[PDB]
C-alpha cells in the first residue's frame, strides 16, 4: 500500500531491476547514469539534467537572463553523493505525500496506467513500441536490457527552479497532443522552493504570519505530475495556445507567457479564463483522437518486438483510454466514458484541487507571481512529514500555515539570491516634471511582474451571434456542475487501483537510443526598459514613495509623495498629519514606551477605518485611505475617494475599462413537422430549454471575461495595499528603532525594548486592515460585474427572448392545424416563460466562498 515500498539510498548496490545505471533517449551519446525505480513505470535520476537537450549542457547563468520573476543558479548543486541521496529521499517522500491523498492516489495510478501508445509502426495492422518511450537498463554484469517506462524525475538544468515536463518527439507524430502519449521527464528539485505573498486568508486566519510563505514542494511536484498525466494520455494543449496580453500601455506588463495548458493545470479561477467555445473545441478534438486509437486497435492484427500477446497489448490500451469492447472484440469510445475520463484528467487533477487535499497555503492564481527562492530540506522528519508537510501537527506550526511561514519557521527556509535582478525587466514610468512644478521628470523603474495583466481581446471568443436550428430532437444539455469534493469521492470509488500494466520483456534497443526533445514554439523576448512620460502620479509612484533603503539618518514620514520620491530620508505616508507629527518627534527615553503604545493605537485606528454606505449598488463599505495610499482615480484625498466612489462606482478602481462585447444573439429557426403533434410540441419545448441555456451561456461568458479582465485588476490593487501597509509598518518601525538607539545604555537597559513585539502587533493590525480591504475590494469586483458587465448580457438576452417569443407564437399559429387541441396551452407557456429574466446566480459560475458571500 505505500507507493514506494522500499528504502532507497544513493549508494545502494545496483541490481539491474530497480537500482541501475540507465541510458535514456539522447541526441548524441550519453553515459549511463545511476537511477532508481521507485515504483512500476517510474524512475528517478538524481543528476542535473545536462542530457536531455544538447543545447543545455552548461550549468551557469545564461548570457541572456531568462524572462521569469525568479530564477536560481548554482553549478555545484547536486554534484555530490550525499546531495544525490538527499535528492532521492526528498522525491520519494514527496511521492508518498501525494499518494497519501485520495486525489494523488488517483493521479499516480492514472500515470502508471498511461503507458505511451504502441504506435511505432507505419504498417496499418501492426502494434510496435516507440523506442524513445524506453530506456536501457544496465545489468550488474555489464550487459543491458531495454524497458518501457512512463515517468522519470531528474534534477534541474542550469536554472535550478525551472521545473517542467519534457519528452522526446517523433518525426511525424505529435505524441503529447495526438492521444498517443510519450514518456515524461520532469526536471524537478525537492531541495528548493518558492516564496509567495498571501493576504486573502486573513479573515479565516487573523493571526496569519507576516512576510513570505513557502510553496509546499508537494504542490509543485503535483503540478508537474498533472502535466505529465496530460502528456502521457496525449491530451496536452499545444504550447502555441497562449493567453496573449496587451503590453502597450504604461501600466501593462511588457510581456507575459502563460499557456492554455498551464491555465488548465492550475484549475480554480485560472482555468476559467478559457471560454466555452475553446473548451468544447478541445474536448471534441481529443475525443476524435481517442476514437482513432480505438480504430487503430481494431485494425491491429499483429504485435512485434515482444513476447507479450496482441490480446494483452490491446487490453492495456483498452484500460488506459477506458475503451468499450463489445463481445466480438471491437473497441469503441463511449462518449460518456470519454467525457468522464477527460474531465478527471483536466478538471479533477488540478493544482487547485491538490491544495485542497494538502490543506496548505498556496498562490491562488498564476498571477500571484513567486517573489523569492528558498533552500529547504524536507527529508528530516523534524522539518516535514508525509501527512502534514511543514505544518506539523501538535506544534506551533500546525495552525495558520505557520510551518510555511518563512519568518516563523525560519530554520526551514534560507532565502537565496534571486538571479532575476529587481529591475532586470522593467518599465520606466516618469511623471512629467511640469506636472510637479520645468523641474526634472520623476521617473521610477517598475518591475515587470508588478505591472497589470491586460488580456488581449483575441482570447475571448464566442459564437453568440450564430443562429441555431431547433428540431424535435431535444439536443438538451445536462447541468455539468463544478468539481465538488463529493464528486471527486465518487470518481475515487469507481477507480481502478487493482492491476497496473506489467513490466513486459521487449527486445533490446540499440545501445544508444537516439532522441530529440519535442520541437517547441520559439518565444520572442519582450522589450525592456520602455519609457513612459505621464501627466499624473501613478499608483506605482505612490507605492515607491513609501519605500526606503539602507541608511544612517532618521527616516521621516511626509504627506508629500513628491518630497518622498526626491529624498531617500523621506517616506510617504497616507496616514494623517497628526501621525506624521507624532512619529517624527524627538522622544525622550522616559516617554518611549508610551510613545510606541500610542503609535500602535494610531496605526491600528488609521488602518482599521471603515465607512459604511447605502448609496452604492452592491458596495456597503468603503476603506477611505485606499484613495491616498495608491492615488486611486488620481484624487489625492480620501474625501475625494469616498465621493468619487459614490459618484462613479467601482470603475474608479480600474486601470483599464474592459470591453464586454455581446452581439445581437443569433435567432432560433424552428423546424416544422406537419402531421405530427408530438414533434411540433417537442420543438417548442426544445426552443424554450435552449433559450434557458442561452442565458446561462451568456452569463458564463461574461463571468470568464470579468474574472480575467476585471477581477485580476482588483486582485493586484489588493496586493499593492498589503505592500503599502507593510511599507508603513516598516517605516514606523525604523523610526521607533532609530529613536530607541539614541538612548543611553542605562535607559535601554531599563526600557528593555523588544522590537519583535512591535513587529507582531503591527502585523496583527495589518491583518485586521486586510480583512476589511479584501471585503471591500471583493464587493467592488462583484459590483462591477453586477452593474457594469452583466446588464449588457441581460439586454441582449431580453432582445432575444422578445424575438423568440414572436417566433414561437408565429410557429404556433403557422402550425395551429397540427396543434389543434394544443394552441392555447402552448401560448401561455410561451408567454409565461419568456416574460421574466433568468436571474444571474454567481454561485453557478464561480466557486469561491470569498466572491460568493458578496453576492
Amino acid at each position, epitope marked *: 500500500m505505500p507507493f514506494v515500498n522500499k528504502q532507497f539510498n544513493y549508494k545502494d548496490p545496483v541490481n539491474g531491476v530497480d537500482i541501475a545505471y540507465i541510458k535514456i533517449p539522447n541526441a548524441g551519446q550519453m553515459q549511463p547514469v545511476k537511477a532508481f525505480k521507485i515504483h512500476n513505470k517510474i524512475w528517478v535520476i538524481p543528476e542535473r539534467d545536462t542530457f536531455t537537450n544538447p543545447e543545455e549542457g552548461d550549468l551557469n547563468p545564461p548570457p541572456e537572463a531568462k524572462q521569469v520573476p525568479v530564477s536560481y543558479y548554482d553549478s555545484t548543486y547536486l554534484s555530490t553523493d550525499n546531495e544525490k541521496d538527499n535528492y532521492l529521499k526528498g522525491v520519494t517522500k514527496l511521492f508518498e505525500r501525494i499518494y497519501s491523498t485520495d486525489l494523488g492516489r488517483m493521479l499516480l495510478t492514472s500515470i502508471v496506467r498511461g503507458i505511451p501508445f504502441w504506435g511505432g509502426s507505419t504498417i496499418d495492422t501492426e502494434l510496435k513500441v516507440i523506442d524513445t518511450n524506453c530506456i536501457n537498463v544496465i545489468q550488474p554484469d555489464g550487459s543491458y536490457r531495454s524497458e518501457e517506462l512512463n515517468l522519470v524525475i531528474i534534477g534541474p538544468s542550469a536554472d535550478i527552479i525551472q521545473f517542467e515536463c519534457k519528452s522526446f518527439g517523433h518525426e511525424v507524430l*505529435n505524441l503529447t497532443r495526438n492521444g498517443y502519449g510519450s514518456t515524461q521527464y520532469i526536471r524537478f528539485s525537492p531541495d528548493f522552493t518558492f516564496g509567495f505573498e498571501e493576504s486573502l486568508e486573513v479573515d479565516t486566519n487573523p493571526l496569519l504570519g507576516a512576510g513570505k510563505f513557502a510553496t509546499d514542494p508537494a504542490v509543485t511536484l503535483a503540478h508537474q505530475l498533472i502535466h505529465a498525466g496530460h502528456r502521457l494520455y496525449g491530451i496536452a494543449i499545444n504550447p502555441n495556445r497562449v493567453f496573449k496580453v496587451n503590453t502597450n500601455a504604461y501600466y501593462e506588463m511588457s510581456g507575459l507567457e502563460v499557456s492554455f495548458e498551464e491555465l488548465r493545470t492550475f484549475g480554480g479561477h485560472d482555468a476559467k479564463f478559457i471560454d466555452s*467555445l475553446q473548451e468544447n473545441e478541445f474536448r471534441l*478534438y481529443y475525443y476524435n483522437k481517442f476514437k482513432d486509437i480505438a480504430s487503430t486497435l481494431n485494425k491491429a492484427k499483429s504485435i512485434v518486438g515482444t513476447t507479450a500477446s496482441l490480446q494483452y497489448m490491446k487490453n492495456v490500451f483498452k484500460e488506459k483510454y477506458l475503451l468499450s469492447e463489445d463481445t466480438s472484440g471491437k473497441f469503441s469510445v463511449d462518449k460518456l466514458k470519454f467525457d468522464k475520463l477527460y474531465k478527471m484528467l483536466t478538471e479533477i487533477y488540478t493544482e487547485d484541487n491538490f491544495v485542497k487535499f494538502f490543506k496548505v497555503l498556496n498562490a491562488k492564481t498564476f498571477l500571484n507571481f513567486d517573489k523569492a527562492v528558498f533552500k529547504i530540506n524536507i527529508v528530516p522528519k523534524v522539518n516535514y512529514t508525509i501527512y502534514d508537510g511543514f505544518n506539523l501537527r501538535n506544534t506551533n506550526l500546525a495552525a495558520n500555515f505557520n510551518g510555511q511561514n518563512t519568518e516563523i519557521n525560519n530554520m526551514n527556509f534560507t532565502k537565496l539570491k534571486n538571479f532575476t535582478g529587481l529591475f532586470e525587466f522593467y518599465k520606466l514610468l516618469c511623471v512629467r516634471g511640469i506636472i510637479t512644478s520645468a523641474l526634472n521628470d520623476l521617473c521610477i523603474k517598475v518591475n515587470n511582474w508588478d505591472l497589470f495583466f491586460s488580456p488581449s481581446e483575441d482570447n475571448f471568443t464566442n459564437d453568440l451571434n450564430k443562429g441555431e436550428e431547433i428540431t424535435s430532437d431535444t439536443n438538451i444539455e445536462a447541468a455539468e456542475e463544478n468539481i465538488s469534493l463529493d464528486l471527486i469521492q465518487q470518481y475515487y470509488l469507481t477507480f481502478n487501483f487493482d492491476n497496473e500494466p506489467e513490466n513486459i520483456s521487449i527486445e533490446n534497443l540499440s545501445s544508444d537510443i537516439i532522441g530529440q526533445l519535442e520541437l517547441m514554439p520559439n518565444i520572442e523576448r519582450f522589450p525592456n526598459g520602455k519609457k513612459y512620460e505621464l501627466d499624473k502620479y501613478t499608483m506605482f509612484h505612490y507605492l515607491r514613495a513609501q519605500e526606503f533603503e539602507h541608511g544612517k539618518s532618521r527616516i521621516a514620514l511626509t504627506n508629500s509623495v513628491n518630497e518622498a520620491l526626491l529624498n531617500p530620508s523621506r517616506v510617504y505616508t497616507f496616514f494623517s498629519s497628526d501621525y506624521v507629527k507624532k512619529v517624527n518627534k524627538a522622544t525622550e527615553a522616559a516617554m518611549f514606551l508610551g510613545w510606541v503604545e500610542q503609535l500602535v493605537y494610531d496605526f491600528t485606528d488609521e488602518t482599521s477605518e471603515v465607512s459604511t454606505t447605502d448609496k452604492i449598488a452592491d458596495i456597503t463599505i468603503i476603506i477611505p485611505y485606499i484613495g491616498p495610499a495608491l492615488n486611486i482615480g488620481n484624487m489625492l484625498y480620501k474625501d475625494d475617494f469616498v465621493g468619487a466612489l459614490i459618484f462613479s462606482g467601482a470603475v474608479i478602481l480600474l486601470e483599464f475599462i474592459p470591453e464586454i462585447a455581446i452581439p445581437v444573439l443569433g435567432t432560433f429557426a424552428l423546424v416544422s413537422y406537419i402531421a405530427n403533434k408530438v414533434l411540433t410540441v417537442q420543438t417548442i419545448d426544445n426552443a424554450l430549454s435552449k433559450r434557458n441555456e442561452k442565458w446561462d451561456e451568456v452569463y458564463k461568458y461574461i463571468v470568464t471575461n470579468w474574472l480575467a479582465k476585471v477581477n485580476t485588476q482588483i486582485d493586484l490593487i489588493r496586493k499593492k495595499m498589503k505592500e503599502a501597509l507593510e511599507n508603513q509598518a516598516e517605516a514606523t518601525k525604523a523610526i521607533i528603532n532609530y529613536q530607541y538607539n539614541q538612548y543611553t545604555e542605562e535607559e535601554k537597559n531599563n526600557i528593555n525594548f523588544n522590537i519583535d513585539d512591535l513587529s507582531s502587533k503591527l502585523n496583527e493590525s495589518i491583518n485586521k486592515a486586510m480583512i476589511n480591504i479584501n471585503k471591500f475590494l471583493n464587493q467592488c469586483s462583484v459590483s462591477y460585474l453586477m452593474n457594469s458587465m452583466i446588464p449588457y448580457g441581460v439586454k441582449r438576452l431580453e432582445d432575444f427572448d422578445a424575438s423568440l417569443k414572436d417566433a414561437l407564437l408565429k410557429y404556433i399559429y403557422d402550425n395551429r392545424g397540427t396543434l389543434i387541441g394544443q394552441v392555447d396551452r402552448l401560448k401561455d407557456k410561451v408567454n409565461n416563460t419568456l416574460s421574466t429574466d433568468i436571474p444571474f446566480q454567481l454561485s453557478k459560475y464561480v466557486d469561491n466562498q470569498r466572491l460568493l458571500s458578496t453576492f
Partner: nanobody
Amino acid sequence: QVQLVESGGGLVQVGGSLRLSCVVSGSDISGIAMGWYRQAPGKRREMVADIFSGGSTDYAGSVKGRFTISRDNAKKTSYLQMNNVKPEDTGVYYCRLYGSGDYWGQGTQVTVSS
C-alpha cells in the same frame, strides 16, 4: 447531415505545389477543429496538419515548412497548400472535421512524380 467534399489533387511534379480543398456542408465549422490526413498503401492513416477554429495550427514534423493548412469559418472550408512535394507525400489525403461524429472527406489521391 454532415458532409465533407474535397477537390483538388492528382499528379504533381516532385518539388511542385498543389492545393487541396474541402467544403463542409450540413454543419457550421465555427468552434470545431479541422485537419488533413493521408494514407499511403499498406500504411496507417496519419495526421498531416491541424487547424483550430481560432486559426492556430499543428503539423506532422516531416511536412512543417512545406505544407500550410488554412480554414474559412464563413465559407466553411479548409485548404492544404502543399509545397516542395516529395515522394514520401504520395497517398490518399482526407480532410476531417473534429466534431461529435466521424466527419471525413471522400479521400483524394495525390501522386508525386519525378
